[PDB]
């Protein structure tokens, strides 16, 4: 009844007034300027999209009665884009975490001169594979009828469509995303394990150089604290490696009782750009931390469609289905929750999305 009708119906505007606040926040705030926000801003696009268009015609059926009141032709639209949105963001999700893996693993990671139009590109690309992979939906339920209409209802009726997609746009980027965060926590932990080893390094040709009455010990501390210094190239990294040169310099020109005082103006650069560096793995890692969350949230929700969809499948004879087909049409609104969480979390972890959400807020733009 209608007891029911009102409880379904904040989702859509949660989700489009969610991800419309995300996708200001992408768009208006400079310190978001990066590939891992631009996906995220595509990610509010196919969110948005998705609340837009499919979530009020789910409702509008819902209110009648689980009963298709639009012209019979756009049923395959409908589902269509019911596929080609959560079908992106399934694969947007899959596409950060990787580019978050691989990104990151070239020594010059902690590099600025990001490449913006290289991520604007794989989000297209992005895009473009999932528009591949929903196309089937629409071309072959123009064609057949009845796979996009189960006896009345619009919904998905052909069972290798739920099967192979089911296995091609759910399943696959779930296991690629695990096995993604694995990997990427295996590999960051890592990271801020030679960053101490270069920062022991550091102290220990410091001390040298404290102590010492010969002048190509100095030389020999400043190399071996040269390699230290390199690190993941953020550039102000060669800042430190230019103020080790320098006093390289000094060294080989000959007067060793100038260099050490210098080595010494040195070592409190040194400790303020460790602390710097270490704790831009920290941040590093929060970040993963984060989007694993968001793809656990996604993941989650989403999992009972799949799993009472395949269940329908197989067991088309020795399982109940009275109630079950019932079960369908509130997992599929949890699943359409799934898009309206995920600014939710932005709001409670990422600072920057904090402030400028509630910028907007309380009567302002
Ligand atoms: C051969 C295939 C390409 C044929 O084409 C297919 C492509 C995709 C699938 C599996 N995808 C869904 O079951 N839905 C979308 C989805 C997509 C991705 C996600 F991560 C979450 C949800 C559901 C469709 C029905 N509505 C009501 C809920 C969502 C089925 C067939």
Redesign the pocket.
């Known amino acids: 009844k209608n007891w029911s009708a009102l409880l379904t119906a904040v989702v859509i505007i949660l989700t489009i007034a969610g991800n419309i606040l995300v996708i200001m926040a992408v768009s208006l705030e400079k310190k978001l300027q990066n590939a891992t926000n631009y996906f995220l801003m595509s990610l509010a696009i196919a969110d948005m999209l998705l609340g837009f268009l499919?979530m009020p015609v789910?409702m509008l059926t819902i209110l009648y009665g689980y009963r298709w009141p639009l012209p019979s032709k756009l049923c395959a639209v409908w589902?269509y884009l019911?596929?080609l949105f959560?079908?992106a963001?399934?694969w947007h999700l899959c596409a950060i975490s990787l580019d978050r893996y691989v990104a990151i693993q070239n020594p010059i990671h902690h590099s600025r001169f990001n490449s913006r139009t290289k991520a604007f590109l794989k989000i297209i690309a992005v895009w473009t594979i999932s528009v591949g992979?929903?196309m089937?939906?629409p071309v072959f339920g123009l064609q057949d009828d009845s796979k996009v209409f189960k006896e009345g209802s619009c919904?998905?009726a052909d069972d290798?469509?739920?099967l192979?997609?089911?296995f091609?746009?759910?399943f696959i980027?779930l296991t690629i995303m695990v096995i993604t965060y694995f990997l990427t926590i295996k590999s960051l932990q890592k990271e801020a394990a030679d960053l101490e080893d270069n920062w022991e390094t550091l102290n220990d040709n410091l001390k040298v150089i404290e102590k010492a009455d010969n002048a190509a010990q100095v030389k020999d501390a400043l190399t071996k604290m040269r390699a230290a210094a390199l690190d993941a190239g953020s550039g102000s990294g060669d800042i430190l490696v230019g103020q080790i040169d320098d006093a390289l310099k000094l060294a080989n020109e000959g007067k060793v009782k100038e260099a050490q005082a210098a080595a010494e103006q040195l070592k409190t650069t040194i400790n303020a750009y460790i602390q710097k560096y270490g704790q831009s793995i920290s941040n590093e890692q929060k970040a993963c931390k984060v989007l694993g969350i968001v793809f656990f949230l996604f993941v989650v929700m989403?999992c009972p469609?799949?799993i009472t969809?395949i269940m329908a499948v197989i067991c088309k004879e020795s399982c109940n289905e009275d109630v079950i087909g019932a079960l369908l049409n509130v997992f599929?609104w949890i699943?359409y929750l799934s898009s309206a969480v995920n600014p939710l979390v932005y709001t409670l972890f990422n600072k920057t999305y904090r402030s400028a959400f509630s910028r907007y807020i309380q009567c302002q733009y």
């Open positions: 499919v789910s589902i019911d596929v959560s079908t963001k399934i992979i929903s089937p939906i919904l998905l290798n469509f739920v192979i997609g089911s091609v746009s759910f980027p989403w469609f799949f969809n599929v699943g």
